Amino acid sequence: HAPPTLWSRVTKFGSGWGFWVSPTVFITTTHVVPTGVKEFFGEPLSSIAIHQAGEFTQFRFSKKMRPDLTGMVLEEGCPEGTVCSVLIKRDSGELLPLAVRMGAIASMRIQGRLVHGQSGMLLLGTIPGDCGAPYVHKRGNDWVVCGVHAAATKSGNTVVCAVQA
Ligand SMILES: *[C@@H](O)[C@@H]1CCC(=O)NCCCn2cc(nn2)C[C@H](NC(=O)OCc2ccccc2)C(=O)N[C@@H](CC2CCCCC2)C(=O)N1
User: Fold this and answer.
1) What are the residue boundaries of the Peptidase C37 domain, all occurrences included?
2) Which of its termini does the chain have fewer beta carbons within 10 Å around, N or C?
């Protein structure tokens, strides 16, 4: 059961969503980042450190954007078989945590782009608007985030999260 504070890290961004890993670090999927804009969350692009690879994008800000938060562990994907939750927020405001059994980390070619991703089997599916929603799982006491939603098959049964380099 994801607690409210964890949901409150999921943030509307561009054509999808992103996730506050910490008071200063925001992650999303590269292709939802809005093109040709000059500020994010009221900060000039000059003030933001941006690291982007394989459809994973990380923003690092120069001040605490979300001081109410603590830092949580960000992993490069998770072990195969791990059951994650995709913390989906819909435009209506509905919360939709989807259980996913994760498979292998792999390079993948999706609509011609290189994705450094991890596929999973949905155990209710994902829609075009859901990209950037975090894949998390609870490690003992703490929550770990390990990817951001990037793609799904036409069936919808298989989902892909982009993961850190
Ligand atoms: C968020 O931008 C959006 C999330 C889509 C979603 O979760 N469900 C929609 C299902 C409808 N749909 C879209 C597509 N297929 N079905 C196009 C892409 N899927 C695909 O090609 O799957 C084939 C595949 C799967 C695994 C490995 C190899 C091939 C798709 O989901 N595209 C994605 C946008 C691209 C854009 C460039 C970077 C990579 C993602 C998308 O629509 N995401």
Assistant:
1) 2-165
2) N
